[PDB]
């Protein structure tokens, strides 16, 4: 079946966006170690590597603003609660038929229920209190092997994007023995091997604070995971 590769990795948090999150202390911080521009540059480089294999890829944020700031800068649809159902399935036939549409972005709507369609590969942009077993249960339902690579010994790939010196690393330790004892093949990742010969996006410091100016003008509510029921 699905042989997948599990893997965190680990972004160090821009000196600005670090200097913010220790200052703020409400949940607005959140955002800060979610919108840090090294882990965008992450997520922007997996989706670049994986889509040159044509591997089909679902982002999941459970965080609105990050949904957005994500999808719209990297050219991607989203679904979120309030994408009509019309609108969300043109996307899911397209990311599921189009050759041209292989990575789309989903919110806490994914799961559950709506029908999640099957990818490839599921990027997790951020990590919180505190389901490790409602992640098990996504990776599961999402992940299929990639046809054909029978031969290979990971045919599909889940990556976790923590942001260093952050709380978000205590939910590592945790994550990487919950997987492991599920009986998954996990890894640290710290450096992805050629992000350097790919043009992302945050190259100039500049371009950083333009989106630092704008995280900090969010509010609490910004920080909040999108409820549903």
Not at 77 to 105: D, V
Not at 108 to 130: R, Y
Request: net charge positive; hydrophobic share 40%; charged share 25%.
């Amino acid at each position: 079946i699905a042989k997948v590769q599990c893997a965190e990795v680990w972004c160090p948090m821009s000196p600005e966006f670090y200097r913010e999150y220790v200052a703020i202390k409400t949940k607005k911080r959140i955002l800060l170690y979610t919108m840090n521009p090294n882990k965008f540059r992450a997520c922007q480089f997996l989706i670049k590597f994986h889509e040159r294999r044509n591997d089909k890829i679902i982002v999941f944020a459970d965080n609105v603003f990050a949904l957005k700031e994500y999808a719209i800068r990297l050219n991607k649809p989203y679904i979120y609660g309030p994408t009509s159902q019309g609108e969300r399935m043109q996307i899911l036939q397209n990311f599921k038929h189009n050759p041209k549409i292989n990575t789309i972005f989903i919110s806490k709507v994914g799961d559950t229920s709506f029908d999640l369609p099957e990818a490839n590969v599921l990027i997790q942009i951020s990590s919180h209190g505190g389901s490790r077993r409602q992640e098990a249960q996504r990776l599961g339902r999402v992940l299929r092997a990639k046809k054909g690579m029978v031969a290979e010994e990971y045919n599909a790939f889940f990556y976790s994007l923590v942001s260093q010196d952050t709380q978000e690393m205590a939910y590592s330790t945790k994550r990487q023995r919950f997987l492991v004892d599920q009986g998954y093949s996990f890894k640290v990742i710290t450096k992805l091997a050629g992000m350097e010969e790919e043009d992302l996006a945050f190259s100039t410091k500049e371009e950083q604070q333009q989106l630092l100016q704008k995280v900090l003008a969010a509010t609490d509510l910004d920080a909040e995971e999108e409820v549903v029921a």
